């Protein structure tokens, strides 16, 4: 999938999580977010297309995805233990990772 | 100090940073923020007064200040290096941390 | 307490954790480790005594303690939920933070 | 690849890095490590074959490779900047991550 596609995926499932009222539905969305983040990890953003694939910018870019992934994985674990509220709380702070990368490269 | 008092010094100094011209000003502001963040770290917010001090909520609450502190110290480092534009971009970014805890617990 | 004192404290309770067979004893040691790490956070190490309190070295030094603290806090939470095994596993990885700082500044 | 096969490429390339003279060599070694780490990320180790794929153990197991990966990429960045001594100090440091997972799950 393209970056925009993964981003929309991240966005959609994020919304599902905020409303879900059962662990089953949160686990499903998080797994799906993990997949999208894993795929965007290697994408080259428009604003950085003119940079070295090994530039400080791209390294920081990929670093954001490595962070997000860790956070999604951490949240998925909480959901697996059936802690919907905690899982949901984790997703709120996770938004900050989304936002930090956007401020820099969107 | 009061949670309300600590929050006021955090909010006022963030503004000082967003308007700052030099490093002395940003450094002084971040320094006061660090102190307010450190003092707030052990507070119990109104909406969690009936929760166990060891609840996931309270653990997550304390985690938020732990994050904020790390973010202020890093911003402070950027400032100590005369990196104003960078320190300010850092202060702007940590706003999301403020927002995340407010959404869940304010 | 002096740095050496906190270090010995960190060391001792670390050993208690590895052997404890009940959550009560792990919670007690972790709380105590948290206290010692919090205190060493501000200490100036022998090898860095000739550096600027705001030098890259000291910033990285303090950063290690901020990491450790977060990890201890995370482990204490697991112990509070009564997950001795998980708590104990957390402490093993935590050792790496101890070791990373020592390699650099001990 | 096999967990044993991936572990052999991780161990052999670490040695190559410890003996390296230039960046080309370290970079090539770290690159192969990243690939082996990425492939191992989803393995189930012998001592956890009877555990649920969602157990805290397995979640912690996957977390270890998540850490390792972040450490190899950072080391790789140091290498891509011709920072050999630094890339090597980084490779030496991540050994503890290897050690931590072995202690718990090998
Ligand atoms: C879970 C967190 C995230 C959410 C909810 C999210 C959501 C979005 C959305 C809705 C868009 C709008 C454009 C579209 O998809 O049509 C977008 C764009 C973008 N995001 Fe994210 N995003 C997240 C995390 C990240 C991270 C961590 C990075 C960087 C490491 C990143 C980099 C970008 C970039 C570069 C764009 C612009 C893509 C383009 O040129 O069309 N995003 N994101
Ligand atoms: C740099 C970030 C922060 C800023 C600028 C900020 C700002 C504020 C402001 C303006 C208020 C309302 C007025 C006041 O109470 O003085 C407030 C309230 C509050 N903040 Fe923050 N805040 C920050 C971070 C945080 C963090 C990270 C947490 C939790 C971990 C938090 C928890 C709260 C709570 C619970 C209240 C309600 C307090 C009450 O009802 O008495 N804040 N904050
Ligand atoms: C929980 C993890 C840790 C444990 C178990 C631990 C244990 C120890 C021990 C046993 C010593 C031997 C000297 C003595 O205390 O008599 C020591 C020394 C030292 N550690 Fe740690 N330590 C830990 C974390 C850290 C961290 C994260 C840093 C840096 C951020 C650090 C910095 C130092 C330094 C500078 C010394 C030398 C102190 C001196 O000059 O005597 N330690 N540590
Ligand atoms: C850079 C770090 C690493 C190095 C150099 C390393 C090296 C090795 C070596 C030499 C072996 C024994 C020989 C072999 O199986 O080929 C091994 C086995 C093993 N390693 Fe690692 N390893 C690393 C990281 C990790 C990590 C982080 C984990 C877990 C998250 C892990 C889990 C295991 C397991 C379970 C075995 C036993 C496999 C079996 O019984 O088939 N290793 N490793």
UniProtKB/Swiss-Prot annotation, chains A, B, C, D:
Binding site for heme b: 7, 102
Disulfide bonding pattern of the chain: none
Domain of life: Bacteria
UniProt keyword list: Electron transport, Heme, Iron, Metal-binding, Periplasm, Signal, Transport
GO molecular function: electron transfer activity; heme binding; iron ion binding
Biased composition (Basic and acidic residues): 47-60
Cofactor note: Binds 1 heme b (iron(II)-protoporphyrin IX) group per molecule.
GO cellular component terms attached to this protein's record: periplasmic space
Region feature Disordered, mapped onto this chain: 38-60
Subunit and interaction comment: Monomer.
Family: Belongs to the cytochrome b562 family.
Name assigned to this protein: Soluble cytochrome b562
Organism: Escherichia coli
């Amino acid at each position: 999938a393209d970056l925009e596609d993964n981003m929309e995926t991240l966005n959609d499932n994020l919304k599902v999580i905020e409303k879900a009222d059962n662990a089953a539905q949160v686990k499903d969305a998080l797994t799906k977010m993990a997949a999208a983040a894993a795929d965007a990890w290697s994408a080259t953003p428009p604003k950085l297309e003119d940079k070295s694939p090994d530039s400080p910018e791209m390294h920081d870019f990929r670093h954001g995805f490595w962070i997000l992934i860790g956070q999604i994985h951490d949240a998925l674990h909480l959901a697996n233990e059936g802690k919907v509220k905690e899982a949901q709380a984790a997703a709120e702070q996770l938004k900050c990772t989304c936002n930090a990368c956007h401020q820099k490269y969107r």
